[PDB]
Nucleic acid binder design. Structure first.
Lengths: 183, 182, 182, 183
DNA sequence: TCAGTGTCCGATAATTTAT
DNA sequence: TTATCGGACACTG
DNA sequence: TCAGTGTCCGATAATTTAT
DNA sequence: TTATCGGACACTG
DNA sequence: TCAGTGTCCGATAATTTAT
DNA sequence: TTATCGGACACTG
DNA sequence: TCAGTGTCCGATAATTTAT
DNA sequence: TTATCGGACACTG
């Protein structure tokens, strides 16, 4: 009954807001909502790490979808098991299912398990996608901003780099690089 | 390299059916590994060892799901581990293996369905403890010492470092029989 | 308005335990329907009747999944029929209901898991008998008629009707004992 | 392996090609690929009907994803029952499994079971969707086309309905309804 | 009254492949 | 995944 | 060389309740 | 669970 | 030769709600 | 889900 | 009124194989 | 799966 929220994001679609509104619509107050922008690091999840420090027997954490609490089924089951012993349950808003009962945890598991397999089948199709596009001749990576014909045409003209980097507005690091590559 | 694993938790120590089934499947005694729950923490030292002696390409065998893993959490981790190591599990009766992605899923599912049905039995077993507990069924090891001779000889005056020598019981139990019977 | 349903398929006709559970659950005996599968094609009249006598709002109780249904297809059908008719099923031991969307899914999954486990047991039993027609083992009902009193009487010049009257057996059999003992 | 294909479509996204492509890519001849586009009417899947009349023992039908062959899970489980007692088996490309074995069927069943659940959950959100908009004020249905301020302005004037529906290009049914509906 | 050149990374910024 | 940015150094004179 | 008396746990052994 | 088995202390006179 | 009038559908077409 | 077409009827004058 | 004789099934009871 | 009961024929003279 001592309600808590949790929201998480992993891509450009930082609609963390859309998550937090979903949380507040469900009666969780800003007071006890915990956020995580997974900066792509091994496991730098501060928000959560702070959530399990304040919850005590009685409380109920809320999350919007399954694939938020946990990246992978193995991790997520441990989390639930911990909490359970601690005396706290998790309610999933969109899935409309929850950890308080036994057939509850069962469904949760069954559900994220079908997720993970689907997740992985996509991951493979995405890597082959890169191969039949990479060998195809498609170009990957940041589009080139710099007018390089304006670097060659300025160095072959006598002038030194420090000068070139100031008149044009770019780092000197780049100027020399542009030179050594065009041989 | 093929490996076996068998485990037991109750009086039905047919570790033999398991160990035989594994042999039939082609596992040499040489690499079959055994554990038998004494009811301690997780002194599954036989398992602990088997996972030391495995390398990329090895395959472990087990007769049924609920052997390897007690709870689905513990189970999934063990596979997550073995998998990283380059090793797979093939379950004989359940007829599936951690070999593929779908494989793992079906394992994960079946244990999850098991744990569930296994929990309901526990709570049912427990509810039944109470419909015979208050009914009047006595619990414990059945009494064996003749208590109509311990109190019959102590009240006569004979010492307590002598009555345990006449009969065949410990000196701890004579003082327990006297004190408790008030 | 509550209803019950119990069913039985083997010697363990503890059809009572079921109806005790359905009365302990709060169904009036008025509303507890019953069937007992002889093993014939499909003679479940009790159900046939129940599904005629229920209206929107009613709930049917049943003790375990594997009662309402032999196989998972039938199982879903029954549910579907009831569903469009304003009635829902509640499985006791299992502790789930066809009340909701998730509700039905869970049921479906469970039966599917069960069916697989069921067809594996069938193929094992089926290899079990096969591989035990190599040693003994003697199948069939145990012989009762004194066959050493039939030959012993027929070689004595006596005729088959006499032998059927004297020993209280069928003339069908008199000849069969003989023609199957050369 | 008598190979066969099957593709199906239910919305504007009639990318029937993508499916038929997937099938050919997987190794079916157009010679044995079969096609159905539902029109929303009761049930008119004449294409499948045809194919299950032409298969025999040994044959294998291919399909791109689960939700193509079967609408609801019973209907799905029944086709398979039919096909099974016939000596055919279905392979699902993207889901990477087939009715081939016992465990096979189980997985198929479990998966569509999940599908149908999450599909109904979507559908009820679509329907509470038209409610946070129905009572919000929005008007549903076809946009009104007949100029009504010329039907009533022509009727109080006195003229009969028959003359009203002949002058303006409207059916006499619509005249009466418009009148009876607005007073 | 120190100052200019050129090299070598780790951060940071935009970009592709897929449901 | 490739591009640029901002600095840290190690040289020269 | 007490030399016995009395209490107070940590191991084991035999049991019960249920699929 | 409850019953026994072997001890370890902490005191006696 | 009705010949005009008013009602009550089943079919179609055009629309909105959403992942 | 609401807006129109075409008809099918059952009446009147 | 035969009156007797043998052969060949379909239904059930008992009994096996396994969880 | 087998063992047996009650019969339904087909034969028998």
């Amino acid at each position: 009954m001592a309600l808590f929220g949790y929201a998480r994001v992993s891509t450009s679609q930082q609609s963390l807001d859309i998550q937090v509104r979903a949380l507040k619509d469900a009666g969780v107050k800003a007071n006890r909502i915990f956020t995580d922008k997974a900066s792509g690091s091994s496991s730098d999840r501060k928000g959560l790490d702070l959530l399990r420090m304040k919850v005590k027997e009685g409380d109920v954490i809320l999350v919007k979808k399954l694939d938020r609490l946990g990246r992978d089924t193995a991790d997520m089951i441990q989390l639930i098991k911990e909490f359970d012993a601690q005396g706290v349950s998790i309610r999933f808003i969109d899935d409309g299912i929850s950890t308080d009962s036994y057939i509850g945890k069962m469904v949760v598991t069954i559900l994220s398990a079908v997720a993970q397999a689907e997740r992985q089948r996509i991951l493979q199709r995405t890597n082959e996608g890169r191969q039949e596009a990479m060998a195809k001749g498609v170009v990957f990576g940041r589009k080139r901003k710099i007018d390089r014909d304006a670097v060659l045409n300025m160095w072959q003209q006598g002038l030194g780099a420090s000068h070139i980097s100031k008149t044009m507005n770019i780092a000197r690091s780049t100027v020399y690089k542009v030179i050594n590559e065009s041989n």
